[PDB]
């Protein structure tokens, strides 16, 4: 459901906020939004390409770990821009 | 006339964008120039703050004063202004927060005087002229 992916991403951000420094969370994570969940793939909207790139390069493992801790399932994480 | 915006890039990002420095140029150009929606601009500003280091002001002052001794220069707090010997040119150096700005005219020696101080302080300064599309590391 539409409200359900919002809940999942808000839960994941709240856990991520307890893991990262304030500058890293505010710069890279806080403005991200859930876009879709289809099959094994969770797609997240990043605010620009620079963010998309750094999220993919540095934070994919952390996000995958967070989703696994919350759900018990491995979801493939993908980033898109507006 | 040359106009450079010079930032001290964090090691992690310098490495990540090695061979892809145009992407950093575009990020900096978006902040200084590109007409962005307010929210895109604010994200860009946050990103720039994250990937750059504060300029080491006192260290710079010391190094500049040593290097410019008996040159035609003056200082106005964070601004240094120089005139080259034999009337060959002029350059202004301004340091603030995370940014250095340089304006130069005449011989390329003018900006080189400042770039030489910078490159001996760190290998991580990225200098960019958004007017001419000239950019690169100040290599030691």
Author numbering:
A (entry chain B): 0 to 81
B (entry chain A): 2 to 141
Source paper text:
In prokaryotes, the DNA replication initiator protein is DnaA. SirA, a protein produced under Spo0A∼P regulation, has been identified as an inhibitor of DNA replication that plays a specific role in preventing replication re-initiation in cells committed to sporulation. Furthermore, the SirA binding determinants of DnaA have been mapped to its N-terminal domain, DnaADI.
SeMet-derivative crystals contain one complex per asymmetric unit (one molecule of SirA, one molecule of DnaADI) while the asymmetric unit of the native crystals contains two complexes. SirA consists of a single globular domain comprising seven β-strands and five α-helices in the order β1-α1-α2-α3-α4-β2-β3-β4-β5-α5-β6-β7. DnaADI from B. subtilis consists of four alpha helices and three beta strands in the order α1-α2-β1-β2-α3-α4-β3 with a β-sheet topology of β1-β2-β3. In the complex, 1240 Å2 of otherwise accessible surface area is buried in the interface. In the SirA binding surface of DnaADI, Thr26, Trp27 and Phe49 contribute to the core of the interface with residues Pro22, Ser23, Glu25, Ser30, Pro46, Asn47, Glu48, Asp52, Ser56 and Trp53 prominent in the rim. On the corresponding DnaADI binding surface of SirA, Phe14, Tyr18, Gln48 and Ile52 contribute to the core and Glu13, His17, Val24, Leu28, Gln41, Met44, Lys47 and Tyr51 are prominent in the rim.
